[PDB]
Design a binder for these strands. Structure first.
Ligand SMILES: Nc1ncnc2c1ncn2[C@@H]1O[C@H](COP(=O)(O)OP(=O)(O)O)[C@@H](O)[C@H]1O
Ligand SMILES: [Mg+2]
Length: 77
DNA sequence: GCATGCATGCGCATGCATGCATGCAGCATGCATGCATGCATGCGCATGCATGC
């Protein structure tokens, strides 16, 4: 504890053009991969992207890696 | 003086601008049904955790 790892993650997420900062249990399930929603404007079925889909061609920053679910860890794998 | 003919008022029918109610119909408004739509309910099922042994 207290060696400034999280500050480094915050900094590296501020320097990258595309980069997302997420914490262990606050981003679980469809908040990582994708979700099914209906588009209000075009009346079509879309897929909403999660953190991993927002950081495509970028850097993803995950904090408290040890606390995540097994399902979330499979996706990272 | 006397005989005559025209203008003026009296008497009689008729038409006609106002005005208003009633029965019938034409006419538009409000109502009943019927349905499309998207949201929220509540309900069993699978997963991840906290507890006991
Ligand atoms: N080497 C360091 N240099 C500067 N600040 C540090 C250093 N180590 C820790 N800190 C400070 O101490 C705190 C550590 O918080 P954090 O980044 O969450 O540490 P950790 O990731 O280990 O939990 C922050 O305020 C950070 O600025
Ligand atoms: Mg930390």
């Amino acid at each position: 504890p207290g060696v400034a790892k999280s500050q480094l993650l915050k900094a590296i997420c501020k320097i990258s053009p595309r980069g997302v900062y997420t914490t262990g249990k606050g981003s679980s399930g469809v908040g990582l991969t994708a979700a099914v929603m209906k588009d209000p404007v075009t009346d079509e079925m879309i897929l909403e992207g999660g953190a991993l889909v927002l950081a495509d061609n970028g850097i993803c920053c995950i904090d408290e890696f040890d606390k995540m679910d097994e399902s979330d860890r499979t996706a990272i794998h």
